[model samples]
Target: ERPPEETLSLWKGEQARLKARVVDRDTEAWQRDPSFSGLQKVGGVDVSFVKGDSVRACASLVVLSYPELKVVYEDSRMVGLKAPYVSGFLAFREVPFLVELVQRLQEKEPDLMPQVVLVDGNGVLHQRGFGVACHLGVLTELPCIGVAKKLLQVDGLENNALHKEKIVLLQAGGDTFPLIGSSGTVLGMALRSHDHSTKPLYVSVGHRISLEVAVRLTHHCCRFRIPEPIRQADIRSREYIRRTL
Candidate 1:
């Protein structure tokens, strides 16, 4: 296997090579075919580290009933880390193992494959529009939505003037407001998700879906701020680590 350092150095130049492969266009065929009304499965994927400048990566997969948000299946992996933290290439670091997890899930329960995935990462809201979620979507060819807890400074959202210039307004809940920040291309969105809270959650398009649908799903899946599937994945991943490591 190629070492981590070489891999990182390689992707620094591999951006352009992979960019062409990403199908940024909407595959709206799903909407016309299925109303997405009877969505049964909501899959969530997340990875947590095992503390200390750690070499162990704890990844979890959870499949839950849609809208109902009941856990139907779950799996976790705590493996030796392959790479250290890298901002832009997080997909490079985490996606391979995550992909393997999904493959196994597909093999074990092909009938229970998630209708959509709520990944704990970003999609087209990155420096090159190929964030972890995007990478995951391309690899899986599944409709994935990115759920990030932090704001990404794309096209520079550093000013009130920028807010007025870039963001579109959406009323989320309570007295809260969500900003649909679009620059160059429509990035993702900031959704307050909860009525009593002001902290917004960042969302981006992973693949095969539109941000509009992604946002609607995000709202539908919200128990509090984090979506139900993601929340469950996070809790379970950490719990597995706590119980085992």
Candidate 2:
């Protein structure tokens, strides 16, 4: 069953209220540099669901040394997802566990803290501007970037013939095209993350990072179609589920 109307209303209110605090510009010095100088640690977060269970999942956090792309720290915990899987309000279900993981890292190993986080979901490119990435960023007070494997198709953006045509044109890694919506705002970018992969990643500003820098950092983190930080998080979370369940 879906959530009650009142709950949906509450989530919408929260999203609207939190969206105002989202900073779309680069707030850190490292974000402005061409090579992302001074960026030491980059973190990635993901929630991997159980094969058939909706309520059980693993929330993962991984921090990697930047440029080198080595995993410095990793955490994955099985969580009981209290909220239902709502497309637009995914953060309400998954972000609390992610926040707890971040808190644990902060208390246990503060030095390993990532300068920025890359969320495996859309950021501002959502039904509302505040997606899971935005929610996590605003709460954690860290620069966050949203990197999604698929298109969100919001604000007049659709994965249609023309969109696929544009993707076809992204012939090289790091090549990108702006995801301008019907409102005429550049919501995100469709990025060719790796030359070997044809599918484009949807990159958006979560908080405190510009879309340009977000895309660049995302490309730099890729050793494959998915960025290393996120790929490791996904791999570990799935493995955690396998080992436990």
Best of the candidates, lDDT:
2
Q: Write the per-residue lDDT of candidate 2 for residues 15-86, one digit (tens) a residue.
A: 999999999999999999988889999999998988779899999999999899999999998889999888
- Per-residue lDDT of 206 in model 1: 85
- lDDT values of the candidates? 0.75, 0.93
Clashes of 2: 0
**TM of each candidate vs. truth:** 0.85, 0.98
> Which residue pairs collide, candidate 2?
none
Q: Distance from true position, residue 45, model 2, in Å?
A: 0.6
Encode model 1's per-residue lDDT on 186-245: one tens digit a residue.
Answer: 677777777755566778888777777787787778888888989998999888888986
